[model samples]
Target: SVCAKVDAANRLGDPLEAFPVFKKYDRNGLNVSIECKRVSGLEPATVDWAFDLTKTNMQTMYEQSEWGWKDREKREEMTDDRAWYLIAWENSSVPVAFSHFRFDVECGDEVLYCYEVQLESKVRRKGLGKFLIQILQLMANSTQMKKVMLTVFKHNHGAYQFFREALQFEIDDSSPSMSGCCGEDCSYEILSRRTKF
Candidate 1:
């Protein structure tokens, strides 16, 4: 049953299609439309835009961590065949934010793995980022996923606080620290919020 659910979710053409209301974000004085698509559905220009946003927003954080900023490797991951994107646009043309996620089996459980959530500088401090995470949670619930999981760099204080405080995410049991000591060895923490399913 678990494997079947994982397979069914990964087979979805557009997981967001099942939730229409979630497609349009019109709150906090922001009117942005959201679309979820497999990486294959994204245009090259759009993928480039996503890459740019992520690098501008996160390159420095990665530099301070164990893994330095990776341009080619990051682009490869963003364009991976299994990647899913939740792209948010302002005024229906300008891309403002995106979340790259995937449906896969992790630790024998079907989980929605969120790889990235990058927001433009202009859109920061608004509710848009939280809205995108909510959509992922909803998708996980509808798709019978065990939880929505993500990895956050502990050195990135702002993002770390956002997920733990504003998002209510907890350190996943699978995190290295839970086994013993992160002890300056692990630069990142794995976090997750289980679906309401």
Candidate 2:
């Protein structure tokens, strides 16, 4: 088999890179079907944002602040300008797993951030998370993104484990943050996956 990488920035070209990786894996082994399609406009109001937040004990705030729609609107506006992209997976043509991403290359073309992914409970433990990541890697390479970066809250150990061990995401730095903690003092570790391999 010829091992080569593809480079694409927009959604149209990126989804095409997924097929090879998709074919290499056993769908029966994973028990879910992931389809990469461009996400645009306002995503549905009912989309789930608690999958990762609940794990960090932020479900209460996530509910109180009703941050879901607020963030969703913000993301929708962002997506219109190419600031974010949402790739979703379905159980049976119903969106069940998703990853949200925005690119950031600081002062150069060598790095790109792969931001966040939130998978619903129904698909959480079936190795679908790692598979979604492999898809991201393929997409990143297609975009000429040298590396993909992300951050995880310290409280969410399962996420840390999944990215670090399962997907081989490397820790770039560990820092205390109030960014997503809603200003009450929380911390997160940043991680990355280089596209070399």
Candidate 3:
């Protein structure tokens, strides 16, 4: 079944390889090479950069939500074997932004689950984040996945609107709010955009 797509997608060596045009991004004042790799293939230095950027961008947000931030737990999660990263390196060296994602079955849907899209403050308004997510949507469509999904804490209104207004992501059917939680019972929402494929 559809879960097989999840397995096949996860087995890819480099999902970005199929789209040569997406390899480099130079716009909105940001110039970088974007590469996709399984977590195990990533360099330790870049992994550290991912961790630090995630911590800096998300810790306070998580602390504001029901889930408190735990540095150790976040480190372990990002380094999980199933993780895949789309890393953007400035000038071909310095790590600047990244999207950590996985191809998996969630609530019976084969999906690309984006766990983090973290960027340094300098890169925030440069349109890099949307570009990165659009790349994930492409990967999901090519791999036969149903959608690209992400969980956004309700407290982070800007992010929620970005996924909503900018990308047109909708609350998934299985999300707490959609499942009768009103979301006052929960602190986060599962958002997804379907692949036309």
**TM-score, structure 2 vs. true:** 0.65
TM-scores across all candidates?
Answer: 0.94, 0.65, 0.94
Note the clash tally of each candidate: 0, 3, 0
Model 2: per-residue Cα lDDT over 148-197, one tens digit each: 77777655679888988888888664433455466665556778877775
Q: Which regions of candidate 1 fall more than 4 Å away from where they truly are?
A: 178-185
Error of 2 at 120 (Å): 1.0
- Span of ten consecutive residues with least summed lDDT in model 1: 176-185
Question: If both were scored by TM-score, which would come out higher, candidate 2 or candidate 3?
Answer: 3
Clashing pairs in 2: 7-142, 8-142, 8-143
lDDT of 1 at 193: 95
Choose 1 or 2, whichever is better by TM-score. 1
Residue 158, model 1: lDDT of: 90
Please report how far candidate 1 places residue 56 from its true position, in Å: 0.9
Better of 1 and 3 by lDDT: 1
Q: How far out, in Å, is residue 171 in model 1?
A: 0.5
Please report the TM-score between candidate 1 and the true structure.
Answer: 0.94
lDDT of 3: 0.89
